[PDB]
Amino acid sequence: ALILTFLGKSGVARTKIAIAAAKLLASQGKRVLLAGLAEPVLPLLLEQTLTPDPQQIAPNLEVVQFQSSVLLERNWEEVKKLEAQYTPIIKEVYGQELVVLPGMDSALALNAIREYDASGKYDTIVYDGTGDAFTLRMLGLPESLSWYVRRFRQLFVNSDLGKQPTNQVNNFLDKGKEALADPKRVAAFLVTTADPLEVVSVRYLWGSAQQIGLTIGGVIQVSSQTEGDLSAEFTPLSVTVVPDVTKGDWQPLIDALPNFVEQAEQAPKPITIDTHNRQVRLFLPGFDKKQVKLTQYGPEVTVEAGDQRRNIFLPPALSGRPITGAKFQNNYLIIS
Amino acid sequence: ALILTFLGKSGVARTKIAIAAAKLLASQGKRVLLAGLAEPVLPLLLEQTLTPDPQQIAPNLEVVQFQSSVLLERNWEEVKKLEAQYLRTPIIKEVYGQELVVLPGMDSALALNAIREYDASGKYDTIVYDGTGDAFTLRMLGLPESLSWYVRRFRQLFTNQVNNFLDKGKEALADPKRVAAFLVTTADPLEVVSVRYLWGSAQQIGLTIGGVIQVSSQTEGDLSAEFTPLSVTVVPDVTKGDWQPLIDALPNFVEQAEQAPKPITIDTHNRQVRLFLPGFDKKQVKLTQYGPEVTVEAGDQRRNIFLPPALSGRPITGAKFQNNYLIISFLEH
């Protein structure tokens, strides 16, 4: 399915857009799952009590609320049942008492999304997340984990000759990496008011998202006390202005939403590898040139920007070949 | 030092409050460190470029931006030194700190460890932390308690100075003079309910919530009745870089934190646990009791209570809300 999410500084507006987007897509015949985190606004706006299990609220529209506590407890039931395939040690430890640590919360939620996607029951999964750098870190897990494996397995394996999962693991992560890089499978839209402070924040998130390979398909401009045409601030992306939702009337907002799928398909690609011209082009808007560092300390080239690091896995064509050069150009970092 | 932070759904308002609180405390002579995340608003509001190292912008006022990449690079070197002290044959010495990728969880851990180091340096009276103001902030602040539960539970299934390290963090988190947060919200009912939910979630980790800062919006209203018994302080906006009116309207954070409700008290004579849990219904709170431990789950946080002798081994006979407190009773007969 398509995992669709929103980045922006204000949670209330993003939850409203997620709800409207789900209502819109459902009414168009798409099978939709709307998923939110542990917070009261989604339930209240929907006038429906939510649970850790999907609930039908309209035709083609189901809604669920992720609770880290419950996802952890359900995964625990799987680890102790596996305690068979390998005397038990963790049987006096009950799922109800497990404590969610930072990081676990994002891994649990991404895995729940993965399960819903894998189920094939939905065309679109609208994720009402935190809409910030933390959502980006979560979405980039496949890539990040793949890199830790790729860089460290060698060091441990080829060092301790004193003492297959790799395929099973790399395959699992690659399938997540593949999906994430495909705009038909994962896309996010920026949400902001005309406040210069919100505009600079989402431009920064836009760039940070390109660093993890997340396509940003467009910008949704919501109302505020500051007026302004944001088009030139987000070129070449479409900025779609939308109205508020008051007193349960979702029609104006629903009718103003953009065509998510089309805009994601037309947006810039986070990364393009040009075999013929032997180069890699990284879309990096929303940063200051001096805020992008390119270095090669390990096997791969590291691109640092937006407090995110990208270790470029080069294909056979570019493999080993020295970096003849690199430069910026209309928000793209071109490396030769 | 007092670690002071703010919880609320709007980042720009929270950053403005954190900046004004820092300016105010530094102007009164408190040694202040204002620490923000890797985001462009703090630097812009202060009209100052920020870096991973504190920079003085006014007397008694330093500002620093936590960049997870840099914190990770810096801890990595400590990992290397450890490898050289504990291994005769290095293995990760090759990997440069600059190529490491930040994983979920690392950001919070690195951020809390940096705060712990500033706090341990003794150079500050207050560290104003401009974080995400949400459930992830709560999960970060409750790390001492969470790691302590793993260490103990997952060790009895068979690290000395470990408990000393964690304990210090736990003692600080529970002390209103050491760690406190204030809610920030407009009169919008959706924001009010989000903040009340965060308020109860904070109580679950033992984080004192000292009060409420009410900021402007298109919706007006008196919020006092929605946050009893907390003081709600109405503050003006900041325009043209004139911080003075906002600064002049801020409450006395330290005093409000000391007067706020206590997340938990145990009455050993009547055999009851009293938990302050505003923002939650009986339907939204689950209790589990295994042996000498009771788990309270609410607001997607879990408080694990190791029962003292007066309560241990006694069935729970009641768990009822009275004026925002959950009173859990234990069997006497």
Query: How far is B149 from B108, CA to CA, in rounded Å?
Result: 18
Nearest to B265 by CA among B297, B318, B299, B308: B308
The answer to whether the CB atoms of A103 and B100 lie below 8 A apart is no
The answer to whether the CB atoms of B108 and A103 lie below 8 A apart is yes
Minimum distance, in Å, between the CA of residue B296 and any CA atom of chain A: 9
Cis peptide before A236 (omega within 30 of 0): yes
Residues 306-325 of B with CB under 8 A from A: none
Instruction: Establish how many alpha carbons lie within 13 A of residue A9's alpha carbon, considering only the half-sphere containing its beta carbon.
Output: 25
Token representation of residue A258: 């953009």
Query: How far is B15 from B63, CA to CA, in rounded Å?
Result: 13
Buried/exposed A220-257: b ≥16 CB within 10 Å, e otherwise: bbbeeeeeeebeebbeebbbbebeebeeeeeeebbeeb
Task: Report the alpha-carbon angle B109-A289-A277, nearest 5.
Answer: 105
- Is some CB atom of chain A closer than 8 A to the CB atom of B104? yes
Enclosing H/E stretch for A201: helix A196-211
Cα Dmax for chain A: 69
Enclosing H/E stretch for A200: helix A196-211
Query: How far is A105 from A112, CA to CA, in rounded Å?
Result: 11
Nearest to B247 by CA among B229, B266, B233, B232: B233
- Is some CB atom of chain A closer than 8 A to the CB atom of B9? yes
The answer to whether the beta carbons of residues B248 and B257 sit under 8 Å apart is no
The answer to whether the beta carbons of residues A53 and A64 sit under 8 Å apart is yes
Buried/exposed A171-183: b ≥16 CB within 10 Å, e otherwise: eebeebbebbbeb
The answer to whether the beta carbons of residues B199 and B192 sit under 8 Å apart is no
Token representation of residue B241: 């870089």
Residues 6+ apart with CB under 8 A from A203: A233, A234, A285, A286
Residues 10-39 of B with CB under 8 A from A: 10-12, 37-39
- Residue B95: its chain A contacts at CB < 8 A? 151-152, 155, 298
Residues 6+ apart with CB under 8 A from A336: A277, A278, A279, A323, A324, A325, A326
Q: Find where tokens 């979630």 sit.
A: B201
Query: How far is A36 from A106, CA to CA, in rounded Å?
Result: 13
Gap between the terminal Cα atoms of chain A? 35
SS3 content of chain B, % helix, strand, coil (to 5): 40, 25, 35
Number of H-type helices and E-type strands within chain A: 10, 15
Query: How far is B3 from A265, CA to CA, in rounded Å?
Result: 45
- Angstrom CA distances, B240 to A88, A123, B39, B249, stand at 65, 48, 21, 17
Minimum distance, in Å, between the CA of residue B171 and any CA atom of chain A: 19
Token representation of residue B238: 């900041």
Query: How far is A313 from A302, CA to CA, in rounded Å?
Result: 10
- Residue A149 phi/psi, 5° resolution? -65, -55
Q: Name the DSSP letter for residue A317.
A: T
Which chain B residue has the Cα nearest residue A206? B39
Nearest to B200 by CA among B157, B293, B138: B138
Enclosing H/E stretch for A231: none
- Residue A197: its chain B contacts at CB < 8 A? 12, 41, 44-45
**Three-state secondary structure call for residue B276:** strand
Query: How far is A30 from A278, CA to CA, in rounded Å?
Result: 40
- Is some CB atom of chain B closer than 8 A to the CB atom of A97? yes
| Experiment type | X-ray
Nearest to A213 by CA among A288, A175, A158, A269: A269
Domains and CATH numbers, chain A: 1-266 (3.40.50.300), 267-336 (2.60.40.790)
Query: How far is A188 from A11, CA to CA, in rounded Å?
Result: 15
- Residue B9: its chain A contacts at CB < 8 A? 10-12
In terms of DSSP H, where are the helices of chain B? 11-27, 41-46, 68-86, 106-120, 135-141, 143-153, 160-174, 189-205, 244-249, 253-259
Residues 6+ apart with CB under 8 A from B176: B208, B210, B257, B258, B260
Query: How far is B277 from B203, CA to CA, in rounded Å?
Result: 6
Query: How far is B295 from B301, CA to CA, in rounded Å?
Result: 10
Residues 6+ apart with CB under 8 A from A59: A26
Amino acid sitting at position A93:
V
